[PDB]
Amino acid sequence: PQVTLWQRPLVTIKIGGQLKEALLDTGADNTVLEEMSLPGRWKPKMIGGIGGFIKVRQYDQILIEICGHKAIGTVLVGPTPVNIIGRNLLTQIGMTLNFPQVTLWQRPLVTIKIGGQLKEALLDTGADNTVLEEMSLPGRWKPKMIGGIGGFIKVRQYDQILIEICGHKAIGTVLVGPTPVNIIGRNLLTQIGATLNF
Ligand SMILES: CC(C)(C)NC(=O)[C@@H]1C[C@@H]2CCCC[C@@H]2CN1C[C@@H](O)[C@H](Cc1ccccc1)NC(=O)[C@H](CC(N)=O)NC(=O)c1ccc2ccccc2n1
């Protein structure tokens, strides 16, 4: 199927004999599930996101069915607020991002122009908002806090900002603060007609 991004791209997964919902997340390198019961050996691991880091258990060679499509790969289990299917599994179900077409064997990076400046950013189906590293933008803004996998961060909220995403123009809300990576979230992805296809 093809999936637009006006709503979170949720799918049904089956893993460890159990059914769950998860988010198709082009911005995630790994697949991370809420605490659950899986069989077998695992290894401790630390992973980062917005907000900081979390400890998870790493299971390798796990069979997972994603909306009926089977994949075997690494699944991390720990204190995430949302089940996320990252690029490690997305590639196995032939997921593509279209807006050109983009495969997910590498991070889906694009060039953006905003506030007169060129930057690189990550096309992120798993992000509700667009969050940029600290930068100089003109105009008024409002304080705000947003959450990610490791907790929360304080950002400045700029509304009605013009941004060019790989040559495509959009106007919307941009958040600016201590993110390690520039991320383009669904609020802007819809405006450039981005779809997921698998
Ligand atoms: C999952 C993991 C493998 C660890 N990958 C990542 O976390 C990478 C890390 C990258 C480098 C650091 C900066 C962010 C990018 C993109 N992220 C993926 C990225 O898709 C990440 C996935 C996610 C979704 C929900 C909750 C937690 C995590 N999304 C986000 O961080 C965006 C940020 C935002 N507020 O718009 N968060 C959300 O969209 C969002 C939505 C609902 C929520 C409810 C409760 C708590 C937090 C919630 N966060």
Task: State whether 33 and 94 are in the same domain.
Answer: yes
Give me the half-sphere count of Cα atoms (radius 13 Å) on the Cβ side of residue 154: 3
- Is 29 an active-site residue? no
Name the residue range of residue 195's domain: 100-198
Asked if residue 108 has its Cβ within 6 Å of ligand 1, the reply is no
CA of 164 to the centre of ligand 1 (A): 22
Asked if residue 51 has its Cβ within 6 Å of ligand 1, the reply is no
Query: Which atom of ligand 1 is closest in space to residue 29's alpha carbon?
Result: 3
- Is 60 an active-site residue? no
**29, 60, 124, 128: which is the annotated catalytic residue?**
124
DSSP per-residue string spanning 123-166:
E-TT-SS-EE-S----S--EEEEEEETTEEEEEEEEEEEEEEET
Q: In this structure, what CATH number is given to the domain that contains residue 160?
A: 2.40.70.10
Task: State whether 75 and 26 are in the same domain.
Answer: yes
CA-to-CA separations, 145 to 50, 110, 154, 160, in angstroms, rounded = 11, 25, 5, 19
The resolution, in Å, is: 1.8
Task: State whether 88 and 129 are in the same domain.
Answer: no
Beta strands (DSSP E) in 17-108 are 18-24, 32-33, 43-49, 52-66, 69-77, 84-85, 96-98, 101-102
Q: What's the rounded Cα separation, in Å, for the pair 160 and 88?
A: 34
